[PDB]
Design a protein that fits this description.
alpha/beta; Rossmann fold; six-stranded mixed β-sheet; 6 strands; binds the ligand Cc1cccc2cccc(N3CCc4c(nc(OC[C@@H]5CCCN5C)nc4N4C[C@H]5CC[C@@H](C4)N5)C3)c12; binds guanosine-5'-diphosphate; binds magnesium ion; GTPase KRas
């Protein structure tokens, strides 16, 4: 039938978590999407021959650590950790998100992909090599994306899926 994958997109405000998701779900680029709306979106795709139902939690809201919040996040099987290549602070925040993923999942090996989004923009303050260094230290893949042009958007989610497959062994 379908193999279900629960994906969770995390990272600072304004990096493109919603644009990335809606590009995958609805195939268009949203200029302004309510920055406060957190929701899960379901999508059927074929990845490497396998029919997949992706359940994608696009995170938002206040920073808080309620039990309900922890419980929503730890249903994630894999995580897209997203920063913008023109937002140094959002890159620096990646480690915090990874730490919270490890905590709620209670594991050192959680399927994860590092995503530098907005690669269409000229005002790059985060070097590709800087983000690669981080990704290699974590043992995770790294990919640059543009939710605006769709460059790399499919690959980023599919790569996460393949990371979940490897985790299952
Ligand atoms: C995200 C997450 C992943 C995995 C498990 C989690 C478990 C509990 C809570 C999580 N959340 C909930 C959401 C959230 C978390 N951390 C920060 O941290 C911001 C800054 C960064 C440095 C610390 N803090 C000062 N901001 C958040 N939100 C505030 C702004 C920004 C994004 C968006 C949401 N709107 C951590 C988890
Ligand atoms: N140029 C460019 N702008 C983007 C890209 N992704 C998102 N944006 C814009 O960045 C702003 C924040 O995007 P959003 O998806 O709401 O970020 P979120 O807060 O992480 O959900 C919006 O105005 C988007 O139009 C991208 O890949 N390239
Ligand atoms: Mg959003």
């Amino acid at each position: 039938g379908m193999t279900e994958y629960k994906l969770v997109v995390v990272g600072a405000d304004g990096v493109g978590k919603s644009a990335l998701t809606i590009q995958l779900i609805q195939n268009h680029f949203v200029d302004e999407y309510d920055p406060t709306i957190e929701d899960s979106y379901r999508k059927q795709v074929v990845i490497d021959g396998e029919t997949c139902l992706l359940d994608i939690l696009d995170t938002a809201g206040q920073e808080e650590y309620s039990a309900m919040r922890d419980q929503y996040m730890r249903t994630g099987e894999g995580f897209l950790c997203v920063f913008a290549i023109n937002n140094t602070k959002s890159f620096e925040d990646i480690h915090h998100y990874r730490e919270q993923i490890k905590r709620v999942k209670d594991s050192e090996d959680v399927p994860m992909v590092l995503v530098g989004n907005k690669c269409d923009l000229p005002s790059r303050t985060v070097d590709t090599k800087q983000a690669q260094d981080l990704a290699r230290s974590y043992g995770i893949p790294f990919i640059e994306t543009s939710a605006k042009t769709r460059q790399g958007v499919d690959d980023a989610f599919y790569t996460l899926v393949r990371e979940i497959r490897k985790h299952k062994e």
